[PDB]
Amino acid sequence: NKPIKNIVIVGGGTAGWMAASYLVRALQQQANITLIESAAIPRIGVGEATIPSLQKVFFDFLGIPEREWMPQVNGAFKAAIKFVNWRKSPDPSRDDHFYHLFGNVPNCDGVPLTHYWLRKREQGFQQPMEYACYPQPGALDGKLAPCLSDGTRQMSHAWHFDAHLVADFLKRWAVERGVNRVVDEVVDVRLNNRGYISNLLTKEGRTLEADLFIDCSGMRGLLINQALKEPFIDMSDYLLCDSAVASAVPNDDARDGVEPYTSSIAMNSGWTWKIPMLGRFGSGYVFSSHFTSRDQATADFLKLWGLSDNQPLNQIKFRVGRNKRAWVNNCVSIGLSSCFLEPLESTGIYFIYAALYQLVKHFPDTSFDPRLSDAFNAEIVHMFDDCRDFVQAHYFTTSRDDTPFWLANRHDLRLSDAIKEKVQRYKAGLPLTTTSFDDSTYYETFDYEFKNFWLNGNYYCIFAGLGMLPDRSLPLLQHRPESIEKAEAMFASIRREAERLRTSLPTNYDYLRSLRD
Amino acid sequence: NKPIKNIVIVGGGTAGWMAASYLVRALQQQANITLIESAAIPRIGVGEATIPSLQKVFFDFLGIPEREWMPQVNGAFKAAIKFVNWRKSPDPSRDDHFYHLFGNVPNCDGVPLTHYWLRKREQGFQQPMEYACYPQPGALDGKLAPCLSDGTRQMSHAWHFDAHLVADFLKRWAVERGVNRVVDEVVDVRLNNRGYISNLLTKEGRTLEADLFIDCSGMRGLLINQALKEPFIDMSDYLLCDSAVASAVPNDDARDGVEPYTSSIAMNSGWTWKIPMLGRFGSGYVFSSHFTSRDQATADFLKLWGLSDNQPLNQIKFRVGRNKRAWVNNCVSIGLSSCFLEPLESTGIYFIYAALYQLVKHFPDTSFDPRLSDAFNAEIVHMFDDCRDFVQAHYFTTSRDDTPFWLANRHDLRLSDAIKEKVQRYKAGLPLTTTSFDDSTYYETFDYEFKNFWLNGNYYCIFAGLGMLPDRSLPLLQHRPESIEKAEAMFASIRREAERLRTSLPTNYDYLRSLRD
Ligand SMILES: Cc1cc2nc3c(=O)[nH]c(=O)nc-3n(C[C@H](O)[C@H](O)[C@H](O)COP(=O)(O)OP(=O)(O)OC[C@H]3O[C@@H](n4cnc5c(N)ncnc54)[C@H](O)[C@@H]3O)c2cc1C
Numbered sequence A, B: 001n002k003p004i005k006n007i008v009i010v011g012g013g014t015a016g017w018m019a020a021s022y023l024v025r026a027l028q029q030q031a032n033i034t035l036i037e038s039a040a041i042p043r044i045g046v047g048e049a050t051i052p053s054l055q056k057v058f059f060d061f062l063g064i065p066e067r068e069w070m071p072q073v074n075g076a077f078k079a080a081i082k083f084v085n086w087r088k089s090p091d092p093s094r095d096d097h098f099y100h101l102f103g104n105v106p107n108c109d110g111v112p113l114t115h116y117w118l119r120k121r122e123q124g125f126q127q128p129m130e131y132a133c134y135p136q137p138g139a140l141d142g143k144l145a146p147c148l149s150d151g152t153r154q155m156s157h158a159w160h161f162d163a164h165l166v167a168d169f170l171k172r173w174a175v176e177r178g179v180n181r182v183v184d185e186v187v188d189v190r191l192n193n194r195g196y197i198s199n200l201l202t203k204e205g206r207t208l209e210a211d212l213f214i215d216c217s218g219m220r221g222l223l224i225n226q227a228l229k230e231p232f233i234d235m236s237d238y239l240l241c242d243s244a245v246a247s248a249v250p251n252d253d254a255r256d257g258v259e260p261y262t263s264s265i266a267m268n269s270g271w272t273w274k275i276p277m278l279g280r281f282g283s284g285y286v287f288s289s290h291f292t293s294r295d296q297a298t299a300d301f302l303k304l305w306g307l308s309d310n311q312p313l314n315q316i317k318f319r320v321g322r323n324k325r326a327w328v329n330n331c332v333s334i335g336l337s338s339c340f341l342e343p344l345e346s347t348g349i350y351f352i353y354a355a356l357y358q359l360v361k362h363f364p365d366t367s368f369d370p371r372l373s374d375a376f377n378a379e380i381v382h383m384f385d386d387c388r389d390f391v392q393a394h395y396f397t398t399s400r401d402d403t404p405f406w407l408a409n410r411h412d413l414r415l416s417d418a419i420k421e422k423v424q425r426y427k428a429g430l431p432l433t434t435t436s437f438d439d440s441t442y443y444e445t446f447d448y449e450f451k452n453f454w455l456n457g458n459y460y461c462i463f464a465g466l467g468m469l470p471d472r473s474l475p476l477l478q479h480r481p482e483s484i485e486k487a488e489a490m491f492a493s494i495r496r497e498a499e500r501l502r503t504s505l506p507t508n509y510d511y512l513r514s515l516r517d
């Protein structure tokens, strides 16, 4: 069969430019790549939070080290997500926060430390799970950097940045490597009688042809949904939010520091993200229009940050769910054209580069063997539905009951068999998937991470944070007092590490400034 | 105009029940009082320290003598606050304590004894000011009662008690006098187009109406802040603490006695209170989250009292400051809904009964003449800001420099013109406000005390305790050697009184037991 040679990508947002750059890098020879993007149709860049695989899977593949790309996108460091007021109805006299940390929890004699922590908790131990089982959360409370001043990594981290600047950085990178950029708008899509895309007609009268089309057109799914009519599986029965109101809010970094984490602050009818950078934070109240009006959500969002009625707001809507198939005929959807999940666990850009990684791992010829696209499609379904369920488990596990929105989350969601089953195992006291690898090894082994994305520690941070604990500790531990003692030595190491970090890390603000103000 | 007849109080904490009982007592006729309080929303009762006006302004007004209410709240006696390690960086080989005593310092020929003490100090006199100028602090060192065994008062005193039990005692008292108690939760507040409160909708579907609403909902300010949108003036530029971690700690009263005073033990990033009762003391490390994590503060608090990781802790947060106005339209805020100051000088419950006293002194009709609420509001601003400044003067005057927290207190606070001016006068050697009245007369004349709350002796105990003394004694004294001699006879009387107290007072523990174990 003849190789795919000509590739057209529709869209110049984060997806389009990630696709152009991943493909120009992967397809060393016999690749002619053209990206078309409209000047009149905006790109989504709200100020975005990410996960460590962005470097290991994406930028490493491009041969771009963190020190090269991060400054160019005015990036800031992210070590966790901090959930605020998710556990109980807000009470201003109570501190309700918990962290979902990067990295994984060690094991002691084949049992994760989370499980030893629960046994201690049964015996009266008061310290929250994540402060017992991870070295860094108090450092995050202190707004400390994830590295020593000399750049020595001290905890797993990812990034906050304006995604517009990342798209810009990759545009520059990809065009320099021979990607053809066309600023123009696709107005019609012509399919042959077999339903493959034949060509694109543009506003300026160009006709684009290709062996392979990548739909990066955003939520409209110009090629995959509009032209090819692939059904979108609306998952609003699983997750209720469908809206956001967002802005950036000036931060006095010198007085207030720069939080080294994303926050998720639970509201009456959704939750607000906070994504710190230098000089400002991005923020958006993600809400369900069925439980609050945009006007009310807007008022709440303003009141939260003490913002004025003159502050310009980005009014957003979305549909949660995914295409029935991501790749149909000669068109692969990547990004918001493929699927959408609310940003509760920073998976949006992940879905872009994970999809790109799988596209190359299933890369077609011009015969478009349906076995390759079937395999790709099943990976995407697994990836998305797994994240959907993990995000949903934040909602149905809360015990907030103060608004109709929280009550509906507790009672009225449709839950997959897969999540029900994971919760059953957790509640029984069983570990969920654990890794034996160091954090470095886990984040360097993407076929492993892709399939084992959410581990025991990820679920524990969420369930324990929300005050939903297993029925009991593992019966096995009653038979292994020496293992319980060994675990105590591990908790002691972790506490030592936390105290060393306290007095060794620069503030996040100082470290960011030293990289370049 | 028609009288206010129907009054609804939201909240059943100390504020709500003080409000119900003060109002049912004051409003002898034409008063229908209903208090609504949620069973699902806790009340603040940490183990609370108070000041002598609680009896003179509050319980006396109700016609309840100390001997009636104190036993019912398992109260213990308080004669002072003892500040530990506030003056210098802690050194375990140095005794760093001083007392802020109740009562006032006498005058000698129109000059307070503090000023004669400073002149002696200039000449080499070693004894600390408060041990020279007050008869009782050595008795407090000896853990002695504030009364003889027969109940004869021997020094000014107030009380330590669990405030839950006081709320309970007043609930009983007020309900017996016709207050209507509703256990239910307000879920919505309806305002008319003019912005007055029209009604309250409750979880159980009741609609509460009233001529006058008293917001005792705690820090959330359900009516005043949430419904009526009155701005809260955040005063975190004035005072840094925003958090506490608290518990009760068993006391072996038979071996260790029961301290007849509250202690304030300065920590790395805040201070710890100690509030003795029979069998236990309440304690809380008040801290600034900007300088320490809750997890670190918790560890420090545990280490301080040798407490175990199984000890249940009350994790508290707060915002220092006050509403811009306490009374808006038909809603008066009282208690934590109105304002908050850290418990450094035991003013929390004071603000409740002082506000109630002023409400009755400015009591409206249904026309809600804004001149009455304006006058009330200005009294509350004066009351709060004056206490804020007095508390703040503990912080900016210390010479501790051992932690970022103490350095920020020394250098980075915003200070009112009023406090700057008082400090200027003190430093110049001038008396601050003095009274000619006996302690009894001062504490029986509340319009006087309310406006002249902190006197020369109060400021001297703090500034002298912190090692910040005036530049010089009063130039006038160089012209009055006979007055200096008369003052010597007064110091001699005080010393005699201290020695008589030594051998005449029962221990606080024995006296408390004799009242009823
Ligand atoms: C509220 C919200 C919050 C988010 N938060 C995060 C987060 O915290 N972390 C994270 O990783 N991700 C997050 N995401 C996801 C992330 O913003 C986007 O997925 C990502 O930035 C890229 O989207 P995209 O490129 O597929 O689409 P878009 O940004 O919508 O870009 C679409 C491109 O297609 C072009 N286009 C459309 N139609 C035509 C046409 N007919 N002809 C020519 N060009 C066309 C447009 O001009 C544009 O260039 C969030 C998303 C939303 C909506």
Ligand SMILES: Cc1cc2nc3c(=O)[nH]c(=O)nc-3n(C[C@H](O)[C@H](O)[C@H](O)COP(=O)(O)OP(=O)(O)OC[C@H]3O[C@@H](n4cnc5c(N)ncnc54)[C@H](O)[C@@H]3O)c2cc1C
Pocket (backbone or CB within 6 Å): B010, B011, B012, B013, B014, B015, B016, B036, B037, B038, B039, B040, B041, B042, B043, B044, B045, B046, B047, B048, B049, B050, B163, B184, B185, B186, B187, B216, B217, B218, B219, B220, B222, B244, B284, B316, B318, B334, B335, B336, B337, B343, B346, B347, B348, B349, B350
């Ligand atoms: C850490 C700390 C230390 C302190 N130390 C001292 C001290 O040493 N000395 C001192 O004098 N004071 C002290 N105080 C102040 C004192 O504890 C409180 O001011 C006082 O006990 C009463 O508070 P409150 O009644 O206004 O609010 P809360 O105790 O918070 O009670 C609020 C009431 O409102 C009800 N409520 C709230 N929302 C609703 C709703 N929507 N519907 C129905 N009911 C509702 C709740 O159920 C509750 O009954 C301290 C305070 C703190 C936080």
Ligand SMILES: [Cl-]
Pocket (backbone or CB within 6 Å): A341, A342, A343, A344, A345, A346, A347, A348, A349
């Ligand atoms: Cl996302």
Ligand SMILES: [Cl-]
Pocket (backbone or CB within 6 Å): B341, B342, B343, B344, B345, B346, B347, B348, B349
């Ligand atoms: Cl107080």
